[PDB]
Amino acid sequence: DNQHKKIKGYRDLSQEEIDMMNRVKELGSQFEKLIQDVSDHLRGQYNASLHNRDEITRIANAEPGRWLAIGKTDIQTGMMAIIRAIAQPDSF
């Protein structure tokens, strides 16, 4: 109970602060859907491109999945930073 007070640096937060943190998380959920949609497109692209070695080689050289992964991480890490700015913890 009241876990936050047991965590170093965590401070009591206003409703306004929580609302903002929650908004960032909600916008992120919309990004997640987009990321899933891109993944779906890539999977279809690979399937449709089966038997075209030349296109398969192009997809492999492009590395689209790695790039989608790099992006997800970035969106997520960024969300955490905006949330940290709102939360303003007292620890390093």
Ligand X SMILES: Nc1nc2c(ncn2[C@@H]2O[C@H](CO)[C@@H](OP(=O)(O)O)[C@H]2O)c(=O)[nH]1
* Residues binding ligand X (CB under 6 A): 3-4, 10-11, 13, 79-80, 83-84, 87-89
26 binds, among ligand X, ligand 3AM, a second copy, none (CB under 5 to 8 A by kind): a second copy
The answer to whether 69 contacts ligand 3AM (rule: CB under 6 A) is yes
SS3 46: helix
- Is the CB of residue 65 less than 8 Å from the CB of residue 39? yes
Q: Give φ, ψ of 6 to 5 degrees.
A: -90, -10
b/e map of 69-86 (b: 16 or more CB within 10 Å)?
eeebeebeeebeebbeeb
The answer to whether 56 contacts a second copy (rule: CB under 8 A) is no
56 binds, among ligand X, a second copy, ligand 3AM, none (CB under 5 to 8 A by kind): none
Q: Which residues bind ligand 3AM (CB under 6 A)?
A: 65-66, 69-70, 73
